[PDB]
Amino acid sequence: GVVAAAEKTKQGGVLYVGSKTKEGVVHGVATVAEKTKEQVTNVGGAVVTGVTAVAQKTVEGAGSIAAATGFVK
Amino acid sequence: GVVAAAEKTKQGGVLYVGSKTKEGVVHGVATVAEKTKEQVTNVGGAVVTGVTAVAQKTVEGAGSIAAATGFVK
Amino acid sequence: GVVAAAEKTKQGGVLYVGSKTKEGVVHGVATVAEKTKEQVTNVGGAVVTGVTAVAQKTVEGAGSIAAATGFVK
Amino acid sequence: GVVAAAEKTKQGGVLYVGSKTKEGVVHGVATVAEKTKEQVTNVGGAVVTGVTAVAQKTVEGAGSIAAATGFVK
Amino acid sequence: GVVAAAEKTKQGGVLYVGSKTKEGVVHGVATVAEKTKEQVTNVGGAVVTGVTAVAQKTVEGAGSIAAATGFVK
Amino acid sequence: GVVAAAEKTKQGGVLYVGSKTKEGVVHGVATVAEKTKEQVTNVGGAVVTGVTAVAQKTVEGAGSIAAATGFVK
Amino acid sequence: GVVAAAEKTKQGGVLYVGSKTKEGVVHGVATVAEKTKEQVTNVGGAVVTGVTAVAQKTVEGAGSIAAATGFVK
Amino acid sequence: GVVAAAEKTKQGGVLYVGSKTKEGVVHGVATVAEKTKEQVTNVGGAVVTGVTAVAQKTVEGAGSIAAATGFVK
Amino acid sequence: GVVAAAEKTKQGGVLYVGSKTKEGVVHGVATVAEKTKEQVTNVGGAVVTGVTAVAQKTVEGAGSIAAATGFVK
Amino acid sequence: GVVAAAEKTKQGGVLYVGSKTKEGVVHGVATVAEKTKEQVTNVGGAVVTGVTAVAQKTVEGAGSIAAATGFVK
Amino acid sequence: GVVAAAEKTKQGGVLYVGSKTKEGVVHGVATVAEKTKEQVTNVGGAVVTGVTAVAQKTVEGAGSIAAATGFVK
Amino acid sequence: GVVAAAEKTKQGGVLYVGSKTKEGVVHGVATVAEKTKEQVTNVGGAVVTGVTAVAQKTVEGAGSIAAATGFVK
């Protein structure tokens, strides 16, 4: 029994990034496996991958994740 | 039994990014596997992948993910 | 039994990106597998993939994902 | 038993992107597999793939995804 | 029995980053395994991976994660 | 029985980073294993990985993680 | 007084080149100048310019070059 | 007074090159100048310029170059 | 008074090169100058410029160069 | 008075090179100057410039160079 | 008075080089000067410049160089 | 009065080099000067410059160099 819920209610900066680079290799949420059974990936928020990665005010409300795996019984 | 719910109710910046690069290789939510049974990917939020990746005020309301996997019984 | 629901109710910036690059290779939500049974991909939010990837105010209401996989019994 | 629902009710920016590049290869939601049984892809939100990918105010209401896979019994 | 909940209610900076680099290799949430059974990755907050990674005011409300794995009985 | 909850309610800087480098290799939350059973990764907060990694005012509200693993009985 | 002379009298190999490349820029006998008076180029032999440049038994007889420049008196 | 002469009289190999490269920039006999008077280039032999440059038995007879420059008197 | 002469008279190998590279910049007989009077370049022999440069049995007979420059008197 | 002469008379190997590299910058006979009068370059022999530079049995006969410069009187 | 002469008369190896490198910068016969009068470069022999530089049996006969510079009188 | 002469008359090895390196900077016959009058460079023999520099049986006959500089009188 997997349940989830969320509720958001609303009754209503000179950021500078300078990047100079060469030969960038970036892996973000790599999951490397061999001879498994189950692989689960739940993303309820920001995943910002780059060579330049800027996030501003991104994840600002009511997140919920519910996971259940296996249960051989 | 997998249930989910969400509710959003509304009763109603000189950001600068400069990027100079060469030869960019970016993997974001890579999931590499061999000889599995089940692979699940739930994205309820931002996945921003790039060489330049900018996210502003992205995920701002009422997210919900419910996953159940396996259950051999 | 897989159920989901969502409800949104409404009773109603000098962002600059400069990119100079060469030879960009970007993989976003790659899922590489071999000899599996089941592969599920649910996208209820933003997936922004690029060499330049800009997201502004993207995912701002009432998301819901419900997944169930397997159940051999 | 797979059910879903959604309800949206409404009782009613000098963004700049400059891109200069060469030889861009971009894969967005690639799912590579071999010798499987089932492959499911549900997109209820934005999938923005490019060399330049800009998303503004995209996914702003009442999303719902319900998936069930397998069930050998 | 896996349950989760979250509630957010609202009744309502000269940051400078200069980066000069060469040959950057970055792995963020790598999980390398062999001959397993189960792999679970729940992201309810920020995962910012880059060569330059800037996060400002990112995760500012009502996060909840509930996970259960195994249960051979 | 795994439960979680969170509630956020709101009734309402000349930072400088200069980086010059060469050949940066960064691993953030690497988890390397062999011949396991279960691998769980719950991220409810910031994971900022880079060669330059700046976080400002990131995780400022109502986090909750509940995990249960094993239970052979 | 510029004189030249030449006389040739005749009283009568598993070479392998493999080249694999990308983005080749080759300048051979470039002579870049500004605000000059005189520019002389005498070629009495081989000038072999390429990305792959193979010369075999090329310049095998009786070369002569005589040059005189200037002489303001 | 510039004189030259040459006389050739004739009274009559598993070489392997393997090249794999990327982004080759080659300048051979570059002569860069500014605000000069005289520029002389005499080539009586091999000039082999390339990314792969192979010369075999090239310059095998009777070369002669005679140059005189200036002589303001 | 510039004179030259040459005379050639004739009364009549498992070389292996393997090159694997990336980003090669090669300058051979560069002569960089500013505010000069005279520039002379006499080539009576091999000039082999490349990323891979192989010369075999190249300059095998009777070379002669005679140069005179200046002579303001 | 500049004279030269040469005379050649003829009365008639498992070399292995393996190169693996990256980012090669090679200058061979660079002559950098500013505010000069005279620049002379006489090449009567081998000039082999490369990232891989192999010369075998190259300069095997009768070389002669005669140069005179200046002579203001 | 500059004279030169040469005479060659003819009355008629498991060398292994293995190189593995990265970021090679090589200057061979660099001559850097400022505010001069005269610059002379006579090459009558081998100049082998590289990252890998192999010379075998190169300069084996009858070399002669005669230079005279200055002579203000 | 500058004279030179040379005469060559002919009346007729498991060498192993293994190099593994990183970041090599090599200057061979550098001549750095400022506010001079005369610069002379005579090469009648081998100049082998590299990161790996192998010379075998190179300079084996009849070399001669004669230089005269200055002579203000």
UniProtKB/Swiss-Prot annotation, chains A, B, C, D, E, F, G, H, I, J, K, L:
It is found in: Cytoplasm; Membrane; Nucleus; Synapse. Sequence repeats lie at residues 19-33, 34-44. GO terms for biological process: adult locomotory behavior; amyloid fibril formation; behavioral response to cocaine; cellular response to copper ion; cellular response to epinephrine stimulus; cellular response to fibroblast growth factor stimulus; cellular response to oxidative stress; chemical synaptic transmission. Keywords: Acetylation, Alzheimer disease, Amyloid, Cell projection, Copper, Cytoplasm, Disease variant, Membrane, Metal-binding, Neurodegeneration, Nucleus, Parkinson disease, Parkinsonism, Phosphoprotein, Repeat, Secreted, Synapse, Ubl conjugation. The 'non A-beta component of Alzheimer disease amyloid plaque' domain (NAC domain) is involved in fibrils formation. The middle hydrophobic region forms the core of the filaments. The C-terminus may regulate aggregation and determine the diameter of the filaments. Soluble monomer. Homotetramer. A dynamic intracellular population of tetramers and monomers coexists normally and the tetramer plays an essential role in maintaining homeostasis. Interacts with UCHL1. Interacts with phospholipase D and histones. Interacts (via N-terminus) with synphilin-1/SNCAIP; this interaction promotes formation of SNCA inclusions in the cytoplasm. Interacts with CALM1. Interacts with STXBP1; this interaction controls SNCA self-replicating aggregation. Interacts with SNARE components VAMP2 and SNAP25; these interactions allows SNARE complex assembly and integrity. This is Alpha-synuclein. It comes from Homo sapiens (Human). The gene is SNCA.
